[PDB]
Design a binder for this molecule. Structure first.
Ligand SMILES: Nc1nc2c(ncn2[C@@H]2O[C@H](COP(=O)(O)OP(=O)(O)O)[C@@H](O)[C@H]2O)c(=O)[nH]1
Ligand SMILES: [Mg+2]
Lengths: 136, 338, 122
RNA sequence: UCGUGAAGAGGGAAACAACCCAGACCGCCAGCUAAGGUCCCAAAGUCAUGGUUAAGUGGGAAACGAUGUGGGAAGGCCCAGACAGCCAGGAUGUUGGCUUAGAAGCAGCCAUCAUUUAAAGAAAGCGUAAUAGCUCACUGGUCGAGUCGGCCUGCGCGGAAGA
RNA sequence: UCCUUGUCGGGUAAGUUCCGACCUGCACGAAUGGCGUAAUGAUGGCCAGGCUGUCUCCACCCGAGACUCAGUGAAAUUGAAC
RNA sequence: CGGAUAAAAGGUACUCCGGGGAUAACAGGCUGAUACCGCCCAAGAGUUCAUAUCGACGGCGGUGUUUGGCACCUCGAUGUCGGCUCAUCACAUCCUGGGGCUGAAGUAGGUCCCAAGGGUAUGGCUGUUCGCCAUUUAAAGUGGUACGCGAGCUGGGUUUAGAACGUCGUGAGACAGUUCGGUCCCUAUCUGCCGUGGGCGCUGGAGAACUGAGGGGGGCUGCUCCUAGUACGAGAGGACCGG
């Protein structure tokens, strides 16, 4: 699974998912997958989506990753009232805003790209879309 | 009921019902005894024979059998019910083999025998069973024992009291077109019958025997010649062995060496079939004259080193089929299984 | 009129002398047993040299009833001491070679005429 | 931080103080209006125009699936005859070589051969072991005017079982 | 201290209670007394024999209430009630 | 650390008083962290063949009956666990009923769909819920009913006050621990339900017979025989339907 080895702080505020996109256009390959819905991606979902599409694309080409967890969350143990400090360490997640690219692809024809991204789109808990790199 | 297949299955026994931890809390008092009970014993697997089933067709369909997992412990000192024992219907005469220096578990010879294959896990303990004065608050529970897992190689092998092996297209299926009630497909081409369609002969009351069908094969250690060891496996509980040799084949070579090599390959199967008493009988005698096929019949006997009666049998014509049955039936009765 | 946990006598030379039926059969909520019935029994007293042993559980058939039977002509056949005959559990063939005491004719309709063949009295 | 109730009545939200309009000096048997409605219960449009809905959707719900349907930008073929039908063709050197007992389009490998008349492949499916037969893509004749499936979107259907 | 109520035997067809025992058991414990103890006990628990409406399954009957009439004549509670 | 004495530690289940749902526990409505149920994505295992049958890494939903937390309270009182009597409702159906698929030859089977009309056990153990065992049938169904029912019963568990055991403290005592015994009141006003009556109405009054707007009650089936040892089936075995 995916997680940074060293973190500046053991826990971070919950935060908000408000705002617009930054990586609207792909700048590394020819094809990419862009998120249309709003939600969160965990380490398992990123690992599952990458594994699912990997079996569909041959080593020929190139694969890019545009999503990192970057956000810690904790969970409260059982039989504990409100208080007693913050929650314990269970797993982390990532913040996703609709409009930025999630995965980037290059090196194999579009038909394989459609099949590969379709397989990985279902395991993502959000609706995505396919885009093609344009000039500039 | 026209094909025979064999496969392997994975049986898993349910682990025991896990223990529970709880503390009763009445509507007024907030402190109560360490409520909770034991788990449920895991469901076992029983290996039961069946008359109606004669193949392992459903076992290719279902390669995994799941026993009922024992119910977990609950409040009010509740113990989960023991998992129901899954019973598997199997044709009689099956042999089961495991891995990791595995061996047979038990031979099935008669219907009604139920064999214990998988032992389910046994239930754990709740906090109540850990009642004591110094502890006075048992938070400990015992996990249920894991179930027993194994992989079974289901080998189906017929209850052929009378087993017969003969030359290709020598009339083995035609021999069943005799008083035997079975109706195997009969045609002139070699290896006409591939599915073993065993039959039964009832000469009189209180006396009957079953006869199985195994097609002939060419000399091959491997699976060559289309047929091979996969059909020889149905043997090895045939109290009598019958050998069929053609006389004057219409297009094949006359038996002077091919009738000898078939004996030799029986030695190398696994153990020469424990050197069971083999009876040699002939066929294709109505094609030629009755008296002409007499001198040449015995000539083959000393050619192959055979010193028995060398019975002359006409399977299609129906002459002498009864004479062979009388001789074999007396031999069967005088030698009971012991 | 034999019910669950009823103490009866034994009417055959199987080896049991005092018996206690434990389960009456016939259907769900089977209340009482008549004259020709299949009833399950537990042996409480038997000769140590007999064919059976104490504590064995098996089936049995009542032959005599204290309440009696009902003849279709307003008649009853009462008895003094309810008795049974020993039968195997898997098979319905009786165990005892001889039958002691009379057996009513109503057992023919229940299809255990073999008992009627024995017991020469009635 | 703002408003409401607390300390505000009234109207709407079926009933409800915190949701909306709106702060009751008193009286009248007058009119106008805010939120909300104009089929009746209950007061007002069974108003007018252009559409969607067939589900009672309206009138509770997700991932997904589908010849439900309306709209839009395109593409292939198309009275030198469109797709699907009906009447026929389906053959050839040719039982294609090994694994092959038996496979020869239909168990295992394709270099995927091409030439004969052309409209048809050493070929996707039954029935066996092939055999022999049913078929298909394709073409010929007749019918004669739209057909083919990808994209975006509105409203729908299943997913949706409790005393 | 636990696992397979610990599991074998009696008791039962079936016994989380009872009885001497296997062990992987030793804390208590020897006048805050230890072991055995005949008899004794409206003392705790278990079993057996006779016995029965305790029960399957209740039915009938005998009396006192319950019911009507005549006489005397309370009660707790009650914001108001169509 | 805006600093009650210069000078002070605990328990009270032997407690009492005045207040509080200003503050816990069980239940009720938020909830799904964990776990149960359904569906989708489908690499792989599957004799050819993905969804005939599983299915790894994930996602979306539903009661939610375990393990939990949150504001709302009946503390001028909301009585439990279990058993007896009494039942009711939903179908996520235990049997009976109608089917689909089957790797369903027949019987016997397995999965799924519709269907709640009826039925759905007797005993030892323990207070038991549950469960084990013994023995039947068609099964001995799952949940709501504040995990139904004490102004119906039971007081066996839980059980204030007595006594004994193990652990901590010098001690009083606390103790989600074990053993013995240990008070369960109410004459029904109203809603409700079971039966029976008085007054009036139905348009002159009265005696009868009823039609039926509607409502309630019962709707369970085992075995054997004939078909037939027929069809099927190598044999073993053994039909559907009807009577
Ligand atoms: N005339 C004659 N023909 C026979 C006899 N036995 C067998 N056959 C023929 O042999 C043919 C093939 O026999 P088959 O069943 O193939 O024997 P298999 O080779 O062992 O499988 C059949 O079609 C029969 O007609 C016989 O006794 N006489
Ligand atoms: Mg043959």
């Amino acid at each position: 699974m995916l997680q940074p080895k060293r973190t500046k702080f053991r826990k971070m505020h919950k935060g908000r998912n408000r705002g617009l996109a930054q990586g609207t256009d792909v700048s590394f390959g020819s094809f990419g997958l862009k998120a249309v819905g709003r939600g969160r991606l965990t380490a398992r979902q990123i690992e599952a989506a990458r594994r699912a599409m990997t079996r569909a694309v041959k080593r020929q080409g190139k694969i890019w990753i545009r999503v990192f967890p970057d956000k810690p969350i904790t969970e409260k143990p059982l039989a504990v009232r409100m208080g007693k400090g913050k929650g314990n360490v269970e797993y982390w997640v990532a913040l996703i805003q609709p409009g930025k690219v999630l995965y980037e692809m290059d090196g194999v024809p579009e038909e394989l790209a459609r099949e590969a991204f379709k397989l990985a789109a279902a395991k993502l808990p959000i609706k995505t879309t396919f885009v093609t790199k344009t000039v500039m | 009921m026209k094909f025979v297949d064999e496969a392997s299955i994975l049986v898993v026994a349910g682990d025991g019902g896990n223990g529970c931890v709880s503390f009763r809390r009445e509507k007024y008092i907030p402190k109560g005894g360490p409520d909770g009970g034991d788990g449920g014993d895991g469901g076992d697997v029983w290996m039961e024979a069946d008359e109606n089933l004669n193949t392992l067709i459903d076992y290719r369909f279902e390669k995994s059998f799941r026993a009922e997992r024992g119910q977990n412990g609950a409040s009010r000192d509740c113990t989960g019910k023991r998992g129901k024992d899954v019973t598997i219907k199997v044709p009689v005469g099956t042999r089961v083999i495991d891995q990791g220096t595995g061996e047979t578990m038990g031979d099935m010879t008669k219907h009604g025998q139920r064999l214990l294959v998988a032992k389910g896990g046994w239930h754990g303990l709740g906090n109540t069973r850990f009642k004591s004065s110094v502890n006075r608050t048992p938070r400990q529970k015992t996990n249920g024992t894991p179930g027993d897992k194994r992989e079974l190689l289901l080998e189906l092998m017929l209850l052929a009291d009378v087993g017969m092996l003969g030359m290709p297209n020598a009339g083995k299926s035609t021999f069943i077109r005799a008083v035997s009630a079975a109706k195997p497909k009969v045609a002139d081409y070699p290896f006409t019958t591939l599915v073993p369609s065993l039959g039964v002969v009832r000469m009189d009351n209180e006396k009957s025997f079953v006869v199985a069908d195994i097609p002939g094969l060419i000399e091959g250690a491997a699976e060559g010649a289309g047929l091979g060891i996969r059909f020889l496996k149905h043997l090895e509980r045939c109290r009598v062995l019958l050998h069929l040799i053609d006389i004057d084949p219409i297009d094949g070579t006359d038996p002077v060496e091919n009738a000898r090599i078939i004996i030799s390959e029986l030695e190398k199967y696994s153990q020469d079939l424990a050197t069971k008493p083999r009876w040699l009988v002939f066929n294709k005698i109505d094609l030629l004259d009755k008296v002409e096929a007499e001198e040449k019949a015995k000539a083959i006997a000393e050619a192959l080193g055979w010193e028995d009666k060398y019975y002359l049998i006409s399977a299609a014509s129906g002459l002498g089929v009864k004479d062979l049955c009388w001789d074999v039936m007396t031999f069967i009765i005088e030698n009971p299984v012991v | 009129m034999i019910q669950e946990q009823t103490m009866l006598n034994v009417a055959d030379n199987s080896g049991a002398r005092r018996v206690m039926c434990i389960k009456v059969l016939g259907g769900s909520h089977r209340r009482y047993a008549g004259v020709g019935d299949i009833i399950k029994i537990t042996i409480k007293e038997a000769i140590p040299r007999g064919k059976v042993k104490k504590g064995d559980v098996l089936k049995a058939v009542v032959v005599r009833t204290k309440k009696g039977v009902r003849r279709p002509d307003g008649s009853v056949i009462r008895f003094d001491g309810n008795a049974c005959v020993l039968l195997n559990n898997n098979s319905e063939q009786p165990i005892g070679t001889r039958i002691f005491g009379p057996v009513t004719r109503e057992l023919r309709s229940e299809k255990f005429m073999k008992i009627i063949s024995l017991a020469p009295e009635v």
